[PDB]
Amino acid sequence: EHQAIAKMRTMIEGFDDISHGGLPIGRSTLVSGTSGTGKTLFSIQFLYNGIIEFDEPGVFVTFEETPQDIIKNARSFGWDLAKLVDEGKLFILDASPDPEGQEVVGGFDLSALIERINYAIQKYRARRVSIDSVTSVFQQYDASSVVRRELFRLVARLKQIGATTVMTTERIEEYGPIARYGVEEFVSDNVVILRNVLEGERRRRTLEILKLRGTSHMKGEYPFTITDHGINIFPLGAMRLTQRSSNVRVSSGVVRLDEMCGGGFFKDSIILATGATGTGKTLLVSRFVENACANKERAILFAYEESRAQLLRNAYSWGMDFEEMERQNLLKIVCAYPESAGLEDHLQIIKSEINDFKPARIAIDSLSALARGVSNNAFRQFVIGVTGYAKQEEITGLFTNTSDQFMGAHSINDSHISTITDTIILLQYVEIRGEMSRAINVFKMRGSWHDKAIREFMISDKGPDIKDSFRNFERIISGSPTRITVDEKSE
Amino acid sequence: EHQAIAKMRTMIEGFDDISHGGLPIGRSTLVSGTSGTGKTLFSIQFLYNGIIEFDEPGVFVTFEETPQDIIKNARSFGWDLAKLVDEGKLFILDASPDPEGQEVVGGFDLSALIERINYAIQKYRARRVSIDSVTSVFQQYDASSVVRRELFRLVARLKQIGATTVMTTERIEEYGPIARYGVEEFVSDNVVILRNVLEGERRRRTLEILKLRGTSHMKGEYPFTITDHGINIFPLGAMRLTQRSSNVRVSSGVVRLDEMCGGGFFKDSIILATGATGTGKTLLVSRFVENACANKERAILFAYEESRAQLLRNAYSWGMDFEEMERQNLLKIVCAYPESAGLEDHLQIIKSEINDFKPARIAIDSLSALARGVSNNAFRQFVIGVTGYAKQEEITGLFTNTSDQFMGAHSINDSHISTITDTIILLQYVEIRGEMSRAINVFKMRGSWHDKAIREFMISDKGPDIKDSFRNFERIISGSPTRITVDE
Amino acid sequence: EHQAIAKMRTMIEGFDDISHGGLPIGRSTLVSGTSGTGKTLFSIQFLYNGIIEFDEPGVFVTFEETPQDIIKNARSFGWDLAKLVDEGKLFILDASPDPEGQEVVGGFDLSALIERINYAIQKYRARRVSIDSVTSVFQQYDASSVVRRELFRLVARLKQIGATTVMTTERIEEYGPIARYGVEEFVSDNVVILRNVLEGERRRRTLEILKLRGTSHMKGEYPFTITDHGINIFPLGAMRLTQRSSNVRVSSGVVRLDEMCGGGFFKDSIILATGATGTGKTLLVSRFVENACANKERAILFAYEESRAQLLRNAYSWGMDFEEMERQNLLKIVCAYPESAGLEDHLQIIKSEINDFKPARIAIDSLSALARGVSNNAFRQFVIGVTGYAKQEEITGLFTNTSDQFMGAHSINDSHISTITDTIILLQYVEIRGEMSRAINVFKMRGSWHDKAIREFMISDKGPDIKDSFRNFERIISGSPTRIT
Ligand SMILES: Nc1ncnc2c1ncn2[C@@H]1O[C@H](COP(=O)(O)OP(=O)(O)OP(=O)(O)O)[C@@H](O)[C@H]1O
Ligand SMILES: Nc1ncnc2c1ncn2[C@@H]1O[C@H](COP(=O)(O)OP(=O)(O)OP(=O)(O)O)[C@@H](O)[C@H]1O
Ligand SMILES: Nc1ncnc2c1ncn2[C@@H]1O[C@H](COP(=O)(O)OP(=O)(O)OP(=O)(O)O)[C@@H](O)[C@H]1O
Ligand SMILES: Nc1ncnc2c1ncn2[C@@H]1O[C@H](COP(=O)(O)OP(=O)(O)OP(=O)(O)O)[C@@H](O)[C@H]1O
Ligand SMILES: Nc1ncnc2c1ncn2[C@@H]1O[C@H](COP(=O)(O)OP(=O)(O)OP(=O)(O)O)[C@@H](O)[C@H]1O
Ligand SMILES: Nc1ncnc2c1ncn2[C@@H]1O[C@H](COP(=O)(O)OP(=O)(O)OP(=O)(O)O)[C@@H](O)[C@H]1O
Ligand SMILES: [Mg+2]
Ligand SMILES: [Mg+2]
Ligand SMILES: [Mg+2]
Ligand SMILES: [Mg+2]
Ligand SMILES: [Mg+2]
Ligand SMILES: [Mg+2]
Ligand SMILES: [Mg+2]
Ligand SMILES: [Mg+2]
Ligand SMILES: [Mg+2]
Ligand SMILES: [Mg+2]
Going by CA atoms, what residue is nearest to atom 7 of ligand 4? C448
Closest chain C C-alpha to B281 CA, distance in angstroms: 11
Q: Give residue C385 CA to ligand 15 midpoint distance, Å.
A: 22
- Counting ligands in written order, the one closest to the CA of A37 is 1
Extract the runs of DSSP E, i.e. beta strands, from A140-203.
Answer: 164-171, 190-197
Chain B, residues 244-273, CB within 8 A of chain C, namely none
Which residues contact residue A445 at a Cβ distance below 8 angstroms, ignoring those fewer than 6 apart? A261, A262, A265, A422, A423, A424
Length of chain B: 488
CA distance B148 to B428: 65
Atom of ligand 3 nearest to the CA of B77: 1
Which residues contact residue C286 at a Cβ distance below 8 angstroms, ignoring those fewer than 6 apart? C253, C301, C314, C315, C318, C320, C322
Strands C463-469 and C455-460: antiparallel
Is the Cβ pair B149, A139 closer than 8 Å? Answer: yes
Strands A190-197 and A28-34: parallel
Neighbours of A244 (CB within 10 A): 10
B149 close contact with A: CB closer than 8 A: yes
Residue type, C160: Q
Strands B463-469 and B455-460: antiparallel
Is C452 annotated in a binding site? The answer is yes
CA distance A451 to A457: 15
Is the Cβ pair A36, B153 closer than 8 Å? Answer: no
Mutate to test the interface with B, among C407, C452, C457 (most CBs of B within 10 A): C452
Question: Least CB-CB distance to B186: which of A133, A369, A372?
Answer: A133
Question: Least CB-CB distance to A139: which of B148, B424, B476?
Answer: B148
Dihedral pair phi/psi, residue A419, rounded to 5°: -90, 20
Q: Give residue A378 CA to ligand 8 midpoint distance, Å.
A: 23
**Chain C residue at shortest CA distance from B437:** C452
Between CA A95 and CA A99, with CA A98 as vertex, the angle to 5 degrees is: 155
Question: Least CB-CB distance to B411: which of A69, A372, A406?
Answer: A406
Q: Which of C196, B152, B322 is nearest to A137 (CA)?
A: B152
Task: Tell me the Ramachandran region of residue B108: left when phi exceeds 0, alpha when psi lies from -120 to 50, beta otherwise.
Answer: alpha
DSSP state letter for A192: E
CA distance B377 to B382: 9
Dihedral pair phi/psi, residue C360, rounded to 5°: -105, -40
Q: Give residue A428 CA to ligand 13 midpoint distance, Å.
A: 13
Which residues contact residue A349 at a Cβ distance below 8 angstroms, ignoring those fewer than 6 apart? A334, A341
CA distance B224 to B236: 10
Half-sphere exposure of C454 toward its Cβ, with a 13 Å CA cutoff? 28
B431 close contact with A: CB closer than 8 A: no
Residues in chain C closer than 8 A to B311 (CB atoms)? 245
Residue type, A282: T
Q: Are the C-beta atoms of residues C299 and C289 closer than 8 Å to each other?
A: yes
Going by CA atoms, what residue is nearest to atom 10 of ligand 5? C226
Chain B, residues 197-216, CB within 8 A of chain A, namely 206, 210-211, 213-216
Write the DSSP assignment of A89-118 as a string of letters. SEEEE-----S---S---HHHHHHHHHHHH
Dihedral pair phi/psi, residue C264, rounded to 5°: 90, 160
CA distance A284 to C353: 65
Residue type, A275: G
Helix H or strand E encompassing A415: none
CA distance B57 to B124: 6
Residues in chain C closer than 8 A to B76 (CB atoms)? 4-5, 214-216
Helix H or strand E encompassing A71: helix A67-74
Mutate to test the interface with C, among B168, B436, B467, B482 (most CBs of C within 10 A): B436
Which residues contact residue B411 at a Cβ distance below 8 angstroms, ignoring those fewer than 6 apart? A276, A404, A405, A406, B418
Handedness of CA C197, C202, C204, C205 (dihedral sign): positive
Is the Cβ pair C156, B372 closer than 8 Å? Answer: no
Chain B, residues 343-382, CB within 8 A of chain C, namely 366, 368-369, 372-373
Half-sphere exposure of B52 toward its Cβ, with a 13 Å CA cutoff? 15
C393 catalytic? Reply is no
DSSP state letter for A27: S
Q: Are the C-beta atoms of residues B162 and B127 closer than 8 Å to each other?
A: no
Question: Least CB-CB distance to B307: which of C186, C214, C243?
Answer: C243
Q: Which of B160, B167, B152, B136 is nearest to B40 (CA)?
A: B167
Q: Is A302 helix (H, G, I), strand (E, B) or coil?
A: strand
Question: Least CB-CB distance to B153: which of A65, A99, A431?
Answer: A99
**Chain A residue at shortest CA distance from B455:** A434
Half-sphere exposure of A372 toward its Cβ, with a 13 Å CA cutoff? 26
Point out the catalytic residue in the list C170, C259, C305, C306: C305
Length of chain C: 485
**Chain B residue at shortest CA distance from C213:** B73
Per residue, the 3-state secondary structure of chain C, as one string, reads CCCCCCEECCCCCCHHHHCCCCEECCCEEEEEECCCCCHHHHHHHHHHHHHHHHCCCEEEEECCCCHHHHHHHHHHHCCCHHHHHHCCCEEEEECCCCCCCCCCCCCCHHHHHHHHHHHHHHHCCCCEEEEECCHHHHCCCCCHHHHHHHHHHHHHHHHHCCCEEEEEEECCCCCCCCCCCCCHHHHCCEEEEECCCEECCEECCEEEEEEECCCCCCCCEEEECCECCECCECCCCCCCCCCCCCCCEECCCCHHHHHCCCCCEECCCEEEEECCCCCCHHHHHHHHHHHHHHCCCCEEEECCCCCCHHHHHHHHHCCCCHHHHHHHCCEEECCCCHHHCCCHHHHHHHHHHHHHHCCCEEEECCCCCCCCCCCHHHHHHHHHHHHHHHHHCCCEEEEECCCCCCCCCCCCCCCCCCCCCCEEEECEEEEECCEEEEEECEEEECCCCCCCECEEEEEECCEEEEEEECCCCCCCCCCCCCCCC
CA distance B270 to B250: 12
- Identify which of A34, A41, A194 to mutate to test ligand 1's pocket (most ligand atoms within 8 A of the CB): A41
Helix H or strand E encompassing A468: strand A463-469
Q: Are the C-beta atoms of residues A13 and A232 closer than 8 Å to each other?
A: yes
A416 close contact with B: CB closer than 8 A: no
What domains sit in chain C, N to C, each tagged with a CATH number? 1-236 (3.40.50.300), 237-485 (3.40.50.300)
Q: Is A6 helix (H, G, I), strand (E, B) or coil?
A: coil
Atom of ligand 1 nearest to the CA of A64: 26
B69 close contact with C: CB closer than 8 A: yes
Is the Cβ pair C152, B277 closer than 8 Å? Answer: no
Cα-Cα-Cα-Cα torsion B320, B323, B326, B332, nearest 10 degrees, comes to 70
CA distance A415 to A376: 7
Point out the catalytic residue in the list B259, B297, B305, B326: B305
B393 catalytic? Reply is no
Burial class (CB in 10 A: 0-12, 13-18, 19+), A489: exposed
Touching A (3+ Cβ pairs <8 A), the chains are: B
Neighbours of A205 (CB within 10 A): 24
CA distance C6 to B77: 15
Report residues whose beta carbon is within 6 angstroms of any ligand 4 atom: B 277-283, 305, 317-318, 459-461; C 419, 444-450
Dihedral pair phi/psi, residue A300, rounded to 5°: -115, 150
CA distances from A468 to A441, A453, A485 (A): 11, 9, 17
Per residue, the 3-state secondary structure of chain B, as one string, reads CCCCCCEECCCCECHHHHHCCCEECCCEEEEEECCCCCCHHHHHHHHHHHHCCCCCCEEEEECCCCHHHHHHHHHHCCCCHHHHHHCCCEEECCCCCCCCCCCCCCCCCCHHHHHHHHHHHHCCCCCEEEEECHHHCCCCCCCHHHHHHHHHCCHHHHHHCCCEEEEECCCCCCCCCCCCCCCHHHHCCEEEEEEEECCCCCCEEEEEEEEECCCCCCCCCEEEEEECCEEEECCCCCCCCCCCCCCCCECCCCHHHHHHCCCCECCCCEEEEEECCCCCHHHHHHHHHHHHHHCCCCEEEEECCCCHHHHHHHHHHHCCCHHHHCCCCCCEECCCCHHHCCHHHHHHHHHHHHCCCCCCEEEEECHHHHHCCCCHHHHHHHHHHHHHHHHHCCCEEEECCCCCCCCCCCCCCCCCCHHHCCEEEEEEEEECCCEEEEECCEEEECCCCCCCCCEEEEEECCEEEEEEECCCEECCCCCCCEECCCCC
Question: What end-to-end distance do the CA atoms of chain B give, in Å?
Answer: 91
Between CA C151 and CA C160, with CA C155 as vertex, the angle to 5 degrees is: 145
Q: Which of C129, C65, C64, C63 is nearest to C91 (CA)?
A: C129
Closest chain B C-alpha to C18 CA, distance in angstroms: 11
